[PDB]
């Protein structure tokens, strides 16, 4: 169902089979981290277009024993051979999105699997073989695909037709339909290897060499050395306050936490519950606010290992009032440049502000 209640645990995921797998882990006395690991594996099989061991993520965990909130950050990294201008052609023109998004230069070193291992080292109570095994079975023996996956195959058939996906997802040249069984024998083999050997098979082993080789085949520069260099990181949340509640969200290298917080701070003083949820006034004020926050994001957000993000200035109450001068029901604001949050910081940016085509 879409809504559930429970006394002793709760799972909510985008695929019924993954939700059942994670609930079973909890029913058998695993903890929420054990369940989350099992769910990631399950979604990699059943919702393969959306996530898995070929990507990365941000796993926020509140630890009920220590009372600390931390984030396992498995975001991908550019390989060493990546270059600032790799998405431009030799005349400086931006390579079209459809093209550059299919090319090997787009592939970051994957983190998800190392993320699951870091979460298991810190919090796990069930062995990793138990947590991966239900997904080995879904991969090896198959499952009936849902509508979202059937639609995705159809909509991405051209992309898939160019790669080793095609024999699995487009058999005999036709997308699998809703309810057809999807069998993923190679993915099963990979999960068995990880079950046997751990992530070394991926980051310093046979899977890794095949990743590097296919990245290079598709024009990218990733090497096995790129793979063996990778490790996840652990981040503290960015915190804010709203409506009497404390909100923990994702810091840089996401824009999400800070800009979600900034939107809430910008709109809070307009007391939007005075307007119907489907009113002109709510939608206008939201649109005006988003234009401001997205403009600050374009200017000031990037990986904080490299660039200085003005987190304090972006959320300073004075800076919020500066931006709010531009948010009104009286008129449409067309002055949508970034503001100057560095007025409310000790330092300055260590980069330029560079317009990007839409």
């Amino acid at each position: 169902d879409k809504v559930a209640v429970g006394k002793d645990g709760m799972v909510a995921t985008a695929h019924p089979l993954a939700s059942k797998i994670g609930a079973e882990v909890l029913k058998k006395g695993g903890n929420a981290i054990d369940a989350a690991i099992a769910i990631q594996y399950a979604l990699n099989v059943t919702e393969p277009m959306m996530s898995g061991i070929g990507g990365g993520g941000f796993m926020m965990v509140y630890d009920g024993e220590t009372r600390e909130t931390s984030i396992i950050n498995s975001r991908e990294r550019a390989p060493e051979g990546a270059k600032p201008d790799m998405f431009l052609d030799e005349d400086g023109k931006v390579i079209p999105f459809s093209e550059r998004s299919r090319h090997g230069n787009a592939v970051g070193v994957p983190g998800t699997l190392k993320g699951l291992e870091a979460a298991h080292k810190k919090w796990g109570t069930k062995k990793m073989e138990d947590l991966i095994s239900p997904s080995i079975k879904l991969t090896e023996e198959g499952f009936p695909i849902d509508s979202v996956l059937a639609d995705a195959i159809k909509d991405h058939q051209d992309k898939l037709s160019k790669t080793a996906a095609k024999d699995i997802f487009l058999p005999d040249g036709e997308p699998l339909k809703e309810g057809d069984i999807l069998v993923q024998k190679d993915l099963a083999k990979t999960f068995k290897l990880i079950r046997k050997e751990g992530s070394k098979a991926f980051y310093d082993g046979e899977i890794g060499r095949a990743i590097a080789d296919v990245v290079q085949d598709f024009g990218g520069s990733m090497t096995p050395d790129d793979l063996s260099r990778y490790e996840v990181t652990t981040d503290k949340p960015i915190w804010g306050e709203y409506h009497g509640y404390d909100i923990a969200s994702m810091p840089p290298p996401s824009s999400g936490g800070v800009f979600m917080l900034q939107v809430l701070k910008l709109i809070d003083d307009f007391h939007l519950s005075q307007y119907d949820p489907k009113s002109f006034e709510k939608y206008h004020l939201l649109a005006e606010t988003m234009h401001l926050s997205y403009a600050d994001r374009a200017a000031y957000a990037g990986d904080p290992e490299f660039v200085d993000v003005p987190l304090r200035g972006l959320l300073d109450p004075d800076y919020i009032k500066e931006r709010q001068k531009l948010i009104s029901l009286d008129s449409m604001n067309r002055d949508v440049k970034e503001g100057d949050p560095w007025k409310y910081e000790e330092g300055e940016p260590n980069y330029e502000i560079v317009p990007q085509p839409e």
Partner: protein
């Protein structure tokens, strides 16, 4: 991208957003190994020089927003969503609807969302009234005339008054919430 969340009997709370960038990422499947490879690096700016330029070993800017809301030091609500740059919009609108409008968690999630990152880029969900949309356009906005689904919020509410959890999955995919009673 996908967002999921878990709570257990010991007070641990997980809110996890995870991705390969586009649907199927690059589309490249690792030969012999069955896994799709991300296109994450296109989240970097294509024209270098800025905060989010490409560099070796750098992480491309994300918009993923796994969140936990707390009251008096304890978790009360998890929120997160897929959608790239729209994630900020999904998460903030869910939080506004639940806390400022006082909606149920499910109504807060299902309320039509809007997104706009510039004067020339707008999205809205079905249920935004048509007249209101057109009036906003008259005023200077640039909503199209077709709706699109925005995001996919899974959330758990931690009901400390009743010692229970409430999970919700968004209608925009076939997600489910499953409780556990030991």
């Amino acid at each position: 991208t996908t967002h999921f969340t878990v709570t257990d009997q010991w007070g641990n709370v997980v809110s996890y957003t995870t991705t390969i960038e586009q649907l199927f990422g690059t589309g490249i499947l690792v030969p012999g190994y069955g896994l799709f490879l991300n296109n994450e690096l296109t989240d970097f700016d294509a024209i270098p020089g800025g905060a989010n330029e490409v560099q070796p070993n750098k992480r491309p800017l994300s918009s993923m927003t796994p969140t936990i809301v707390f009251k008096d030091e304890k978790p009360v609500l998890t929120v997160g969503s897929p959608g790239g740059t729209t994630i900020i919009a999904s998460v903030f609108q869910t939080i506004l609807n639940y806390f400022e409008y006082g909606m149920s968690l499910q109504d807060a999630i299902e309320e039509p969302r809007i997104y706009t990152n510039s004067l020339t880029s707008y999205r809205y969900e079905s249920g935004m009234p048509e007249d209101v949309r057109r009036k906003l356009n008259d005023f200077g906005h640039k909503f199209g005339s077709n709706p699109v689904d925005i995001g996919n919020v899974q959330s758990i509410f931690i009901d400390r008054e009743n010692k229970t959890f409430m999970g919700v999955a968004d209608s925009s995919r076939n997600g489910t919430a499953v409780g556990v009673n030991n």
